[PDB]
Symmetry: D2
Subunit: 305 residues, 4 copies
C-alpha cells in the first residue's frame, strides 16, 4: 500500500483536501508538511497525523504527495519532490509561469514519475455525467462568480488562480479543441481583476467562460443547450434538465459529501490508481498546461492594448 504525503497548510485543505484523506483503503496518509511550521502543527495534532519538519523528510518517507500550498510555491515544491523521485499531484496552477510548467512536465517524464494537476472539476460526478451528453451540444456557458472578492493580487494572479478553473472545465467539456474568438478583461484602478468573459468555438458549438469578482453572490453554473435537451448545473450539486416532458431535478444521493461533489475524491483516487497501474493521468503532460496556455494567450493581449 502506497504512503501519501500532503503539502498544504490548512486554509482550504483542512476543509476538503484533508477530510478527503479520512478514507484510507489501498493507501496510507504518511504525514504532511507546510511552509508555515506554525498554523499547521495544530491540524496535524487534531487529525492525529505525522508533521514533517521539512519538505526534505516528508518527501523522504513518501511515495507520492498532494501539493496544495501557495501557487507561488508550487514550482519549487513540485520541483523538489520530483527530484526526490516522488509522485506528485499539484493544485490547479502547475507553476505561475508557462515555461516553468513545461519544465516540470519534462522533469516528471524524464524521471519516470507521474505529475498531474489537480483539476478536481474534471472529476465531479455531475460534470462527467454532462460530458457524456454534449454530443449534440450547440451552446456551453460556465459562470463562476464571487460575492465580493476583488483579490489583493493583480490580474495575472487571479487569472491563473481562478479563471483557469473555468477555462479548464469548459474546454474539457467541449472535447478540448476550441478557439478563442473573443472576450473581455475588466480591472479596477488597482489593476485587480473585476470581470472576465470569453467566447470559444469548437466547430459549431459556442463556448462561454464567465467570471465576476463582485457579483454579490458566490455561484457556479454550467448551462448546456444540446439537440433534444436543455441542461443546467448549479454548484456541482444541482442538476436540472428539460427533454420536452417538463423540468427534471436529478436526485441528490442522500449521503454524499460536498468533497465528493466537487470532484476532490475522484481526483485523489484517479491519482492513486495511476501510480500503481503506472498509467498516464487524465491531467498530465499536455493536459496539464493546456488551459494555462490559453489563459496566457489572453493576458498577453489584454496587456498590450
Amino acid at each position: 500500500k502506497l504512503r501519501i504525503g500532503v503539502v498544504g497548510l490548512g486554509g482550504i485543505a483542512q476543509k476538503a483536501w484533508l477530510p478527503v484523506l479520512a478514507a484510507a483503503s489501498d493507501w496510507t496518509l504518511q504525514g504532511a508538511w507546510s511552509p508555515t511550521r506554525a498554523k499547521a502543527l495544530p491540524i496535524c495534532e487534531s487529525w492525529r497525523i505525522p508533521y514533517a519538519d521539512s519538505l526534505s523528510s516528508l518527501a523522504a518517507s513518501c511515495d507520492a504527495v498532494f501539493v496544495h500550498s501557495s501557487t507561488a510555491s508550487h514550482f519549487d515544491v513540485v520541483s523538489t519532490l520530483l527530484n526526490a523521485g516522488v509522485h506528485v499531484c499539484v493544485d490547479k496552477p502547475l507553476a505561475e509561469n508557462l515555461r516553468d510548467a513545461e519544465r516540470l512536465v519534462e522533469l516528471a517524464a524524464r524521471k519516470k514519475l507521474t505529475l498531474m494537476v489537480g483539476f478536481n472539476r474534471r472529476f465531479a460526478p455531475l460534470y462527467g455525467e454532462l460530458k457524456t451528453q454534449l454530443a449534440t451540444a450547440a451552446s456551453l456557458r460556465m459562470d463562476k462568480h464571487r460575492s465580493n472578492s476583488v483579490g489583493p493580487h493583480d490580474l495575472y494572479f487571479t487569472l491563473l488562480d481562478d479563471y483557469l478553473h473555468v477555462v479548464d472545465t469548459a474546454l474539457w467539456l467541449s472535447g478540448g479543441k476550441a478557439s478563442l474568438d473573443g472576450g473581455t478583461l475588466l480591472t479596477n484602478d488597482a489593476g485587480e481583476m473585476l470581470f472576465a468573459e470569453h467566447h470559444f468555438s469548437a466547430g459549431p458549438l459556442q463556448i462561454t467562460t464567465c467570471m465576476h469578482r463582485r457579483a454579490g453572490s458566490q455561484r457556479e453554473t454550467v448551462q448546456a443547450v444540446t439537440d433534444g435537451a436543455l441542461i443546467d448545473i448549479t454548484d456541482m450539486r444541482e442538476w436540472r434538465e428539460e427533454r420536452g416532458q417538463g423540468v427534471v431535478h436529478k436526485p441528490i444521493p442522500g449521503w454524499q459529501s460536498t468533497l465528493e461533489q466537487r470532484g476532490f475524491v475522484g481526483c485523489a483516487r484517479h491519482f492513486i490508481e495511476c501510480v500503481q497501474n503506472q498509467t498516464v493521468p487524465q491531467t498530465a503532460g499536455e493536459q496539464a498546461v493546456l488551459a494555462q496556455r490559453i489563459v496566457d494567450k489572453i493576458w498577453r493581449d489584454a496587456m498590450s492594448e
Copy 2:
C-alpha cells in the same frame, strides 16, 4: 377615443392582441380583416367585430390599425394603410426586406403618421424593470428556445419572425450601442434553422443572443451579471436576484396577466398614446429597424 382596427386573425391575434383591443375604455374596436377571409367571418362574430372585406374598407372606417399577418404581406398592407391616413402598429418585422422597411418609415414621416413596430418585449414590466439595473452590467445573455419547432419556414423567416425578438430585446436592454462580434448559424439539409448564437460588445459589457429550435424546452430567459448583483428573469414572469444576502423572488400580484407581463397591453397603450399625443413611439424610425439591420447582415454573411 380613436377607432381601432385589426389585421390578421391568426393565432396570436386571437390569443394576444384581440383580448387587449376588446376591453378598452379609451378606444373602440371597429373592424378586422384577414388576407384569407376564411373562417374570418366566424372569428369576427366571436368578437363582435364588423368584418372588412377590404383593407381600404377597414381603413376608411378606422383611425389606427394593428397589423399582424404573414411577414411578406406587411409591406403591401402597411404602405396601403399609410396611404389612407391611418396610424399603424406593425408586427415585429416592419417589412420582409430591409429597404422596404425603411421605405414605410419614410412614407410615414412624410404622411405625418405614427408608425411603430410592435415589440411587446420592450414593454414587459420585468424587462423594463431590468433595463434600469444594468447601469453596471458586465454580462447579459438572452435565451429563447423551442422544444421541437423546426417548422416549415426557412432560416430567413425564423431570423425575422423569432430570433429578431432576442436580438432587439438584448440590444434595447443594453443601452443600444452594441457591435456584432461573432457567432454561428445551424440548419438541417432542408435549410430550416436549427440553432443560432451571437456575441455583441457595448464597451466592457458582453451580450449574448441564443436560440435553438429543438432543445426540449420552450423556455425564455434573461441573465444579468452586474456589479453587486445577479438577476435572472424566466418567461417574463419570474424575477430572481442575488445581492449578497440570498436569492429573492420578486412577488407576482393578481396583476398576473400573461398579456400584461409579456408587454402586449403596454405596447397597445403606448401606440395609441403616441397617436393621440402626437409623439414619437419607442419603436419608430431607426428604432423600428435597428435589430433587423443586424439580423439581415447575419443572414447575408451566412449566404456568402
Copy 3:
C-alpha cells in the same frame, strides 16, 4: 344558442368572471346587471355589453345567469332569477344561511331549473388531474393564506367567504366522505378571523385544511402523499411530483390564461352544457350545500365554548 346574463359589479368579475365571457361560441352574452348602477356602467360600455337597468329586465331577456355579486345578496338574486324561470350559477356561497340555501335548492328543482354553485376550483385542470391520482393517498393538506387581509367582517362571514373554498376543494378531492376530527379557530379582539385549520379523516386518508389571514404571503397550495408519489401544487399553476426518479415540474401550456388555470372557464362551460343537455351540474343539490354544512358545524362549536 343560449343567452347569458351576468350579475356582479366588477370588483373581481372584471378580472376573471368577465374576460371569461370574451369567448362566445354556442352561447351569447345577453347583457349584465349589478346593484351599484354606477361602478358598472363603465365596464358595460368599455366591454361593449348591454346594461340591464334592473334585475327584472336582465332576467326577462336571458335563459341563464352567472351571479357574482355580494354574498349577502346571493339569496335574493338567485331567488328572483329562479322565479323568473332562469338558470343560475351562484358564486361560492349559495346563501349566507344554511336553511336559505336548502330552500333555493328546493325551489330550483321544484321549478325544473338548474341551480349550481360556482366552485371554480373543482374545474381547475391541475386539481382535476390530481383527483385521478389520489387513489392511494394517505395525506392531503391544502393551504390558502392572505398576506394581510384581516377582513372587516366577522368570523362567520370569512368562514363562508373564504374557508368554504378550502373545505370544498379538500372534500371533493378526497371523494367527499370525510369526518371532522378536530381543528382550531383563532380570532383577534375584533372577533375577526385570524386563523383556521381543521383535520378530516376519510378512512385512513388524513385531510387538512388550513388558512391564515396574516401570513405575510398570498399563497395557495395542495400537498398529496400517496403510495408511490409525492405531489405538490402551487397556485393552481405549478405542479411538482416525485415518483422516485427526481422532482418533476409538469410543463405549463405556453398560451394558457390564469382564468383557465383557476377553473373559471371549465366551470362556465360545464354550466352552459348542463343547461342544454339538461343534466344535473357537478355542484348542484347536495353538492351545493355540502361543505357549507361542515363550515356551519364548526362555527356552531367555536361559538359555544
Copy 4:
C-alpha cells in the same frame, strides 16, 4: 481533553459520527466496539481506532462513549457503560422499552454521569434558527418520507428508529407542551409500517407529524405558518421564508457540511461540553424520553 469512545460501526457511524469524532482538537478518539466484531477490525484500522474486544475494555479506556447500535442492545450497553463511570451519548431510542429508558436515566442521576440522547436534529442550525421565529406560530408540519423503504423491521422498530425523529423535533420546535389529538397508522399484511400521521395541539398552534415509507421521495421538510411570515425548510439545508415582499432563500456558506447542517457536529460538541462543564444536556432526563413516551402510547393504542 476527554477520551472519546464509539460503539457500533454500522453505516451511520462511519458516515456521520466517526467523521465528527475524528477531526477533534478538544478530545481524542481512543477506541471502538461493535457487537459483531466482523469487519470491525478493518473498519477501526481505516480510522486508526484501537479496536476494543469488549465493552468493559473500551470503557476502561474512555471517558465518554457515543453509542449507536441495534436499538435492542442499547439498554444492556448503556447500563453497563454507566456502571463503569463513563458518560454516554445514546442514539435516538434511549432504550427499546420505556421503563428501561427511565431506568438508565435514573441510573445516570445516581451515578452522577452525563447521559443524553443524540437527537441531532435539535442541533441543526436551521431548525434551531426556526425555533426562534415560531413565537407567533399557528401551524407547524414536519414531513419525512422514503421512496420505497418498507424495510424488514416492523412498525415498532420504525416508530422508534425513524418516526421518533419527527415527533421529537416537532414537539421541541413548538415549545414542548403539545397534546396528541389524533392520527392514523397503516401497515401491510406483514405488519411493516407504511404510513403514519398525527396531530398535536399546544394552544392555538396545530402540529402535524407525517411519514410515509413509500412516497417516491426521500424528502424531509418543515412548514411554519406564523403571523407575518411563512417559513419552509427542506432537508435541513434549504431555508425559504415569505414576509410580504417575496420569497427569500437564506444563503448557504462554505460551511456547507452535511454533518453540520444535520446537527451531528453540534450534538457532539454539546455532549462533551456538558461533560466537561458538568451541566445538564438539552437531551437528558425527561427530555430524553418525552417523544418516546408519546410514540409508545400511539403504538400501544394501535395494538388495542
